Design a binder for this molecule. Sequence first.
Ligand SMILES: OC[C@@H]1O[C@@H](O[C@H]2[C@H](O)[C@@H](O)[C@@H](O)[C@H](O)[C@H]2O)[C@H](O)[C@H](O)[C@@H]1O
Length: 717
Amino acid sequence: PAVRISDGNLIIKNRTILTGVPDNVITTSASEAGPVEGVFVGAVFNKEESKHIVPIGTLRNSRFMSCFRFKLWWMAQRMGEMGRDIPYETQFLLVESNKVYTVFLPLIEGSFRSCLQGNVNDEVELCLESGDVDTKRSSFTHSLYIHAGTDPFQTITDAIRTVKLHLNSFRQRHEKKLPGIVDYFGWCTWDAFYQEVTQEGVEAGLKSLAAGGTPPKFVIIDDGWQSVERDSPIFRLTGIKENEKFKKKDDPNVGIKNIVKIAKEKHGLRYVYVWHAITGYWGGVRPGEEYGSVMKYPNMSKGVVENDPTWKTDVMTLQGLGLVSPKKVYKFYNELHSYLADAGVDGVKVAVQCVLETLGGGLGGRVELTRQFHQALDSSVAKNFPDNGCIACMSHNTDALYCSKQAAVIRASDDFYPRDPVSHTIHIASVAYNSVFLGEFMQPDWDMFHSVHPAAEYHASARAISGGPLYVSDSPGKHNFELLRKLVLPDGSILRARLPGRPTRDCLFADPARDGVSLLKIWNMNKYTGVLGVYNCQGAAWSSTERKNIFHQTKTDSLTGSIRGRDVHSISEASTDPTTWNGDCAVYSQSRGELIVMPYNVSLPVSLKIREHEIFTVSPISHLVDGVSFAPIGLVNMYNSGGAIEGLRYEAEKMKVVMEVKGCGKFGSYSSVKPKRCVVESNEIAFEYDSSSGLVTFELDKMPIENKRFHLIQVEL
Ligand SMILES: OC[C@@H]1O[C@@H](O[C@H]2[C@H](O)[C@@H](O)[C@@H](O)[C@H](O)[C@H]2O)[C@H](O)[C@H](O)[C@@H]1O
């Protein structure tokens, strides 16, 4: 049977994960299609209610990782061993068995949303809420799904697919179209000007980054462009057009079209995005007949308030939101977005998403109001921004995730806070662990950062390995181009990795923000290399007592951990012959400038102090003949070097390697022997060769000529 409840125990492949499983908990593996390698779990109750806690069982001595909502809008990670350690508002839970990994996915069923939570007795409890007193229920069959496997990343994906086949309300990440912005460098106005952003400031920032040789090809005009008014009072949307700062200096009938033309035609941007809340603005839309806006006041749910008590006295909660009617929500988004699309705007960054869950009172609840708003947002986006131009922001609730049918980019953490020194380590931990779960739905966006900042290289390097959009919110003139050149090429393009950056197998269950012992290792893939980033992000975490992000004591400053080729979980998929491949890798340290050969399973020591990091490119070695091995590295002066290699063919019969490389700069490869000739576009070129390490090195001079996209490279051993 494989996943079953016998006696009062939940049993996974002959290991007891939970005990004391109460009588009223019903399971089922039946489906549409029809048996399933796991178990939908529900419960039946006496009373009809809008809220229910139900013990699923008792969890002891079984290491887990959780993503839990520390604010209404965002998730972060927590590890532990006992049920009591499971935070309120836990939305994804991963359990290990000392070999076997088990995922618990609390789900949406009908009008109800579920999350998990611990209590003092180590019970894992399932909290089912509708977010509206008028919407009540007593039986549930499908509120939690449990699935087990031996690869923890595959286990997660397989459970998500099964949940998709049941709900049909969302698509997996790999099934959605990414917007073009992910392939380019961008700039976001938010940290530069905040709400004081003007059209002259937008131009200033685009101009200054292009001047330094790293021209952005997209821009996010962030919060500050819209027309808003007060009734410290909350602002509400008064119209869908732009405010006075984005009307031309001259002719007020030309609006945001102006900064769009200037960005595109004058400054050579490809895309322009703008920001709006899902509700219009922070305080919604000013009440009116037009969009049916009526004042609503956020309802507090206990889990949220327990972890984020300041949400109780937040401005949106006390002063309320003008909530567009469901009957009119499509009209609202379509008229807003039609205006923008007609002005040359290519997408929207849509924020404040989770409020919807608090406004379902009298309206069907949190799941239904969320489905309705998202259905209409998705229609409006597909219509008006057909490049799928939507970035999800403040959207870490499951209500939204399990109805994510179209949108393909999601902010994966709380904001970048240039001025809060506690935030930087936490940001990196959060973004990695959250991406384990959010990445199954959308491509994670690791947020803007600043190029001139003490933690600049820490953020930048992590963004390079994220697989996400790469953008800064530098103020005009406050740039570090030596840093930016490691991320962005002269035409604005980046070296994006294929997957969401994620923690390695050996970090999934060791909390690198809290355990004072481990470095965080993050992996990702390119076509022909993996990449691995190592971070000491110790010293700071969300506190369960203070309920906010704080510094905490750690015994050392410096920590030692180890790196292995197989830390890059999917590294086989970079090898040109994964059946013959013996598992050995060329490991290039970006910072130290060192190439080392690492045999399958051999560990390499890495030492890092807090806020330090190191990036390694990891290339499977190909064995052409005895004594002639090779592995491509890529653009060695960029963080994700391996991201440059577009094609790779080994012709062992002619002792030759053929590569298609994009970009320009110093190219690097591993070779156990001195090449005979290195050729770039049918022309021999000079190279250097470190005989001791095998590092081959030459210059790719210009960006590819044309339109012709890749440099063709032949390395002749
Ligand atoms: O207006 C700025 C916009 O709001 C941001 O949300 C912030 C908010 O400003 C905070 O201070 C908290 O309320 C919340 O935790 C936090 O994520 C978006 O992430 C995004 O960068 C966007 O530009």
